[PDB]
Every structure is written in structure tokens, then in C-alpha cells.
Design a protein around this nucleic acid. Structure first.
Ligand SMILES: [Zn+2]
Length: 55
RNA sequence: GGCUCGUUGGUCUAGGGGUAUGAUUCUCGCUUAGGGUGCGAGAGGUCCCGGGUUCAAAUCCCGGACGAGCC
């Protein structure tokens, strides 16, 4: 006789840790009026070695 | 042994140099008995990360060990 590995355990679903979105919201923090590319939660503010307002 | 680690708005595509191209997707109209199929419009990308190079280069060239940090 011969036998080999197979099958998988039971699984579930309902979401992807994302919820509803729109082109006016942010993917990183879920706020509105901006996108992740400009998110205020990122280390690219409020101060750094490039103020971008005096240079 | 303990603690922290929310960037889903494309993906795939060749890369003998231009942010893009090609294949597919989502929404709506028209088409159809019908969410289908085709066509048009709208939703679409500084295409591994950092550094170097002539206007412009994933594999142009170069580095990249078991995920990382703290106690
Ligand atoms: Zn944000």
C-alpha cells in the first residue's frame, strides 16, 4: 500500500482588515481629505531636516 | 521568557533608458431573455529599497543571512 499528504483544516471569512473605502480617504489611518502618500501620522512631519517653507 | 510593529486605491507584463506600455479588473450606459459578451466613458501606477552615472536606465551599475527593535 502507498499514501501521501493532502487536504486542509476548516476556514472562515467576512473582511480583509480594510472595510469600506473611497478616493477621498487614507489607506494608512482611515481619515479623510488626504491619502497615505501625505498622511499626517507619518514621520514626514511636523518637523525634519527639510522644512519645505524656508530652505 | 515578556513587550511593540494600522501605508488594502491594483496585479501581471519586456526592461539592449523617459513618469509608461500591453494583458486583465471595478462602476455606468448601449447591446442581451438574463449579473453574460463586445464597445464607449469614468475608477488606474515616480513598475524591490538605498547609493552612483551621460538628457532618461527592474537585471544600467552596486550592497541587501535566519523579519527587526527594546527589556
Ligand atoms: Zn492618513
Amino acid at each position: 500500500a502507498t499514501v501521501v499528504s493532502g487536504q486542509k483544516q476548516d476556514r472562515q471569512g467576512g473582511e480583509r482588515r480594510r472595510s469600506q473605502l473611497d478616493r477621498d480617504q487614507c489607506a494608512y489611518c482611515k481619515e479623510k481629505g488626504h491619502w497615505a502618500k501625505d498622511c499626517p501620522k507619518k514621520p514626514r512631519g511636523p518637523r525634519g531636516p527639510r522644512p519645505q517653507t524656508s530652505l
